Amino acid sequence: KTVRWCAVSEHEATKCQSFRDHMKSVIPSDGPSVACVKKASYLDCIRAIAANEADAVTLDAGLVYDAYLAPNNLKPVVAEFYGSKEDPQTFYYAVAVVKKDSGFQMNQLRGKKSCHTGLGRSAGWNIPIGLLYCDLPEPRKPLEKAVANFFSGSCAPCADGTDFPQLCQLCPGCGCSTLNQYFGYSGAFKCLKDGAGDVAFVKHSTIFENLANKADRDQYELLCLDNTRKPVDEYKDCHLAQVPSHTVVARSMGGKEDLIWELLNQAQEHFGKDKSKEFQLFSSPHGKDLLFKDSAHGFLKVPPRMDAKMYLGYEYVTAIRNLREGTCPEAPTDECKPVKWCALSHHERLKCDEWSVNSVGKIECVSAETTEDCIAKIMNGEADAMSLDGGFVYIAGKCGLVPVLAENYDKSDNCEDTPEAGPNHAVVTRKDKEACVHKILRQQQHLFGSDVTDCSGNFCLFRSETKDLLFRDDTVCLAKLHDRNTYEKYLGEEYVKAVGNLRKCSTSSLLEACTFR
Amino acid sequence: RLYWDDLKRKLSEKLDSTDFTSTIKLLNENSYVPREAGSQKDENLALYVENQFREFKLSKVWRDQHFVKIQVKDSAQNSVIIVDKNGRLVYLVENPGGYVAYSKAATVTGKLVHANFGTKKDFEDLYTPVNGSIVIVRAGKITFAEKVANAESLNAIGVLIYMDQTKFPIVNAELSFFGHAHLGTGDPYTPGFPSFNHTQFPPSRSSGLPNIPVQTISRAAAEKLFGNMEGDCPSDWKTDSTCRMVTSESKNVKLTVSNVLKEIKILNIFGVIKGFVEPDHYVVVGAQRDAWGPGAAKSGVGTALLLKLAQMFSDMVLKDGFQPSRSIIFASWSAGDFGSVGATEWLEGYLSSLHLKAFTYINLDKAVLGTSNFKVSASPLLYTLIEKTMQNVKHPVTGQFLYQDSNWASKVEKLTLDNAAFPFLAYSGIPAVSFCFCEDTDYPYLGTTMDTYKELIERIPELNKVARAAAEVAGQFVIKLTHDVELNLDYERYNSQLLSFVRDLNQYRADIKEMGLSLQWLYSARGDFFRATSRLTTDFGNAEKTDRFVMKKLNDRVMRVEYHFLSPYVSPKESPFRHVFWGSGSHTLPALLENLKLRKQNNGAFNETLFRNQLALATWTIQGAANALSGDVWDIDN
Amino acid sequence: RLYWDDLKRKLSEKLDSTDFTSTIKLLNENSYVPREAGSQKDENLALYVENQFREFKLSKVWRDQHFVKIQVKDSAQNSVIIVDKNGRLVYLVENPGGYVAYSKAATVTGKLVHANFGTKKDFEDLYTPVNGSIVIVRAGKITFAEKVANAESLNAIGVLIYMDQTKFPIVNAELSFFGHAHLGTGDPYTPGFPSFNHTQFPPSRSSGLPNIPVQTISRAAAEKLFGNMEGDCPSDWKTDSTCRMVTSESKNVKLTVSNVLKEIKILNIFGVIKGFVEPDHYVVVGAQRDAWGPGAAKSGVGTALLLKLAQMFSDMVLKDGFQPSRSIIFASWSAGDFGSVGATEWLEGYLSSLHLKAFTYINLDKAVLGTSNFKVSASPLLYTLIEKTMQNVKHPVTGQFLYQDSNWASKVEKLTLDNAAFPFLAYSGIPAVSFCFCEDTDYPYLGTTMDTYKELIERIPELNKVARAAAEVAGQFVIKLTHDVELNLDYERYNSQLLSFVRDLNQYRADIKEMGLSLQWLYSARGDFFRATSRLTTDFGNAEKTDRFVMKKLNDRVMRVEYHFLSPYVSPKESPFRHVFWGSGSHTLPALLENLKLRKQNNGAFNETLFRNQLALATWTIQGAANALSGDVWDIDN
């Protein structure tokens, strides 16, 4: 069946028409087809898929955030890779390009003119703005007005020209349309080469896409985080931050993830790169970066389990939410953010709730249906910690969660001081909350750990109503791991490979998602 | 077009050009010099304020008129005398200019025992039984009504209220004061319903009213009484050394009160500025207008701040370009001296019209009384709104921000009965707030004939600045509440409130296990509530702020929280204050614990059959509020 | 994409392929053969229906489980005997297989007087005083509970209920029947709140319960009783010639009831299809599952229609392309025999979650019992919705449309206590409807052990067609209620209801003028209400139907009407049925008139102080509903 596609501008509309005509020459072999819908911006494209007018359109990782928000509700299905087809990369480098011998550095951008790819895009706004949000003079909200005062002249595609005149000083009206002269990676580089802006925030591959001569590329330099400048060719050693790649999004329910991937896997072979001379999916004479990014070298399927907030990751989802709210993290106060424990069954959150009250609110309970579900919550921020067995720690570990405590079963004089090898049950947690989990749970040990059999009168933490409600019942104490142990460092070496081989045949939806990027 | 910071600065500029002192003084002129409720001078100011609202060119300005019953001291003045065991003897003590409204007015005679403040705790620590005698107490620890209510509980005959020198450093010791003994709010002769000629005013009496006669007396009169009494008062109470514990077995006191009722014409003057996105939703701002005395502090400042805030927001919309999302209503209540009557008859009158339309009430009464510290009592749904405003507004005297106590959320105290915000939060279920630039010791001439403008401007030199600081705080509550799509109500602030309740109740886990009871259900009730808000928070985070439709379905769920804590098991006529957390009576969470405290002693004071029901309804009131907050009617797991 | 006419035809096609008879028979198999509430056979069908909902592939399917207290006849069977003046004498009359739930079970003895049906009117026309004697009555004029309630009012000792031959042409004269005497709904041991282990089931008793013992007896047993009685029954009542007025002064009857209570596990099985535009708003469709006997007519048909309607709408959404705007919830209630318990514990349990989310309830119990005429009782907000459906659906036997009586709106009767829709409309304030393909005379085996499938299919040959006609009527109520943006609720239909009230009350204008009262306020109350709807109608006419935002602000104001008539002056625990128009007790508009009728006679039966308050609260309940319907909180003129 045909899948409707969204096009922005007249230029991308003609590229869509050619995407239709060229496709039906070897199509349909089984079913796949393509349609075209004309919209003014990407915002119009995300809203159109939600009203079943279109079905798929490619978006920037930072624009993916806007797509999964209500009422758009769109999850990434097929993500494009950068580099080569042999060795694919799921993350591109966001960098800052400037002219040679300008004087300006990363810290000294105030008063300078800027050229951005598009408001809310990864390389263009969030990576570049992101570091400056806490250095920006108050008020921080709105964020757009602060950038309108920091820089002297700026061009931000997709930005309200009536509310923020200064933000469209370089490109009047601030067209999100392909047609505007400064739009996209190559559009901000054209805002720089022409001499309109002093700096352009783009992808590392933007310099090659616009200039082919190596002598002409030497006239430009790349800024580095440590207020230094380096050759454009050295993108790996000097760049701002690593962001997830551009991806096509469709509805969570009724978006046919399989009908779009079957179309894209076939659009790459027939009219993709180094395959045909008549039609290319990553190059067009009518415009650059149409439909897909020219820098892309193919497509890759997005696991079923992996949702938008899992595709971007805690590190990036939290940076966008803090960027739009204007929240800047102060030097750690060691006050300790309330801990969010994850319960699985009815019996778990009933012992948890009795524990939440006894802990004077230092521990709270979040409920999830399955064991893998809890692991997902700790990831995006909905939960903080849970106890897991040796097999699951290896699954969670491959996701990005390092364990900090281990359940010891052998009673001794110094239980917390000396941990046991075994593998035993480990309390996995997130990178940041590792400090408090390490401290709050250690405070409950002196309060509800090893206690006399007075439980009916007083609460006991390791005793359960049935068997192993949160922690295992035969546990004496939660051992503190002094070494910075990961999933590999806690599970030895022989056991690590053991569970890796067995997960090869018996594969879960959580494992294929965390091992995707 | 205009944002918060562009609004904060635009307000501040308007505050700087606004002269408050001149306004408070113009409200204390000869023509408003006497301001009793329903008097011609009361209506005079009513017409002034109404005409002033119209002069500001507001979107609409209307008035409601009620015919409530108050109580006044007639030609037959009340008197307090000491008598002999066989009959009337000795000497007269005082004739009181100031009376207590809702007074029994029945002549009584008996031993006089000092109950101190009249607190429920004060009566338990008394070595002298009050069973069948007249009690004397010092005002300002508990509302006048509660003093009497507490005395009538241990079977008292009468109540004498005086102002000691320690708590009230006043020079004139012959000064009398006013107040009401009605435990509750609104017209007591029309409880539950409005005082509109429509109801035909049927014979209905409020359970608030106390049979026992109450009278206020000056410091000099109580001193005279102590002369006839014996027993030195405990150093536990910071009081005068004049204070005496009980009367001599030879002579006792005889109080005779004969206050008559009076039907008056009360006027409530309103004004409204319609919002631009959702006009049907509004925040209400009120302020008391009537006063027994001159009331410069009691209502002068309030009505002054109300008129000016109405002006400043009128000028911000008309000239500045302020475009509010939700409407704002300015209210001048009358009969406030008798228990927030004017405001309560309004709530009991259009309850259905402001059901889930009014999402917050801001009170301006007694905002300026001191200069030392900043005090504010309100509904937790306003805590975060206050905390951000506290660290934004600067104190009028010291150049520092108002936000200095980090753990100030914990130090806040429940709203009291005498406050005009009480009816809104406890009866209506409308988040309410009442801030004050209070003093460590309450205002001495609060209910006297010395509440003049001169007295106020002398105790607070920089009255203009404190009034402007005050108007800035209430001004930011509105700008925040109507400004943007997000509603400044923090439903997550109730987690701490519930955690506090369950923890206090957990202390008695031994008495719960002794009875056929388990506390596990209250744990899950509070736990499910936290999940409900957390899911609501994430729901706000995972939605497009610019989409009108999805924000409305979330803000409507936020407003409902205030309503859901109003018990659905009590009759709104007999127990008006239904709110579980801030209302009155047995159903409330505090009453559940108060009843259980009697179980610990193994006395017959504990009603077991009552507790089992207090627990069940409150367990489910918290659960129902939880289920209704998240998961829908089918997405709910337990 | 799909419109009404495309939906009507798509439903009809689904109805034509649906076999009901086969379904009702499968529910009357040996495994569901015994269906008492809380029995294993009751839960067996519960699991079947649940699994069936899941098989339809609905959006969500859940279950609620309550632990309510019912009453059952134990090893100690009850007995009715005639005794002598000195002691036990003569002969035994009957042992009853069928009992009356909530029975006093206290052995009593006294004269037996025939009260006929037991109606409040029947007791007034009795020449024989009931003061201190046992009364015998015929069932089906008033709910069992009301019969007893009315007898306990004139101080009775006991109550005997039998089925006369005229009203119940049954062959077997030894047949006994079942029912409950609880005046009200839901578990009587947890009034106001749900029967969830959460509440810990505290000691609480419903004011519904009657101390007097009640028992059912067959026709043969009453005939035997008449043998010992004398006095021919009036021809006024269409009854048997066996009927006798009173017992002889020599011999009197002795009833001994000893029913015990039983805590059971009740299950409510639900299922829901989420709407597409506003999922949070839903219409609820329920049907009783449990039955004392075989209950083919009592619950067999209902649960059969519920399963099939769930199927038909599941197939219409999944395959046809039906896109509902609001969700639909299918409910299988249990314990219905004891007073719509299952459904009432649900309402008392998630009241807050379906506050203004549930906008209509459709009941499927006793939909098919006859074939002559079509009967439907409901809330006027559904009158227009019914009238359009009536002239759209064709009778199953005669090829004519159901809409034949033009003035049928007037002939409709209030919803009764035994109906499952009663709690929804009177307690919750959710428009409800209960249609029936009824007969001039009620179904004879309704509460007997002869309510089998065979008996049903024999009295109604074309059971399949009548069931399909039935399912079409309820099917159009849903398609209409969830189909399009406009909500099929006609708030203008209440104008006639109020006009009717005021006109009836106007008749007593002479007694109103005699008292310090004026009726002019009720005129304006009704007048202001008409203006409010008319302004709401014009508001609907002057708005773009395609604009989501302005239709929501109008449909939300339409749904609130049902809520606004629920009195806000009575305690929801003691007087659950608050609705002014369809509830119970003094506050209701009918009670206001009923009390005034006693004033016309100049007797002491009239409570004047009560009337003045009945009038005032009802005058304002109507006014408050009016103000809240139009003009806002400031656009209101009076």
Ligand SMILES: *[C@@H]1O[C@H](CO)[C@@H](O)[C@H](O)[C@H]1NC(C)=O
């Ligand atoms: C209202 O009633 C009062 C008496 O209580 C009367 O003086 C007044 O004129 C009445 N006003 C109206 C509009 O009925």
Ligand SMILES: *[C@@H]1O[C@H](CO)[C@@H](O)[C@H](O)[C@H]1NC(C)=O
């Ligand atoms: C609920 O209480 C009943 C006794 O009334 C008991 O039999 C049942 O096991 C309890 N169930 C739960 C979940 O507490």
Ligand SMILES: [Ca+2]
């Ligand atoms: Ca009142």
Ligand SMILES: [Ca+2]
């Ligand atoms: Ca109940």
Ligand SMILES: [Fe+3]
């Ligand atoms: Fe990008």
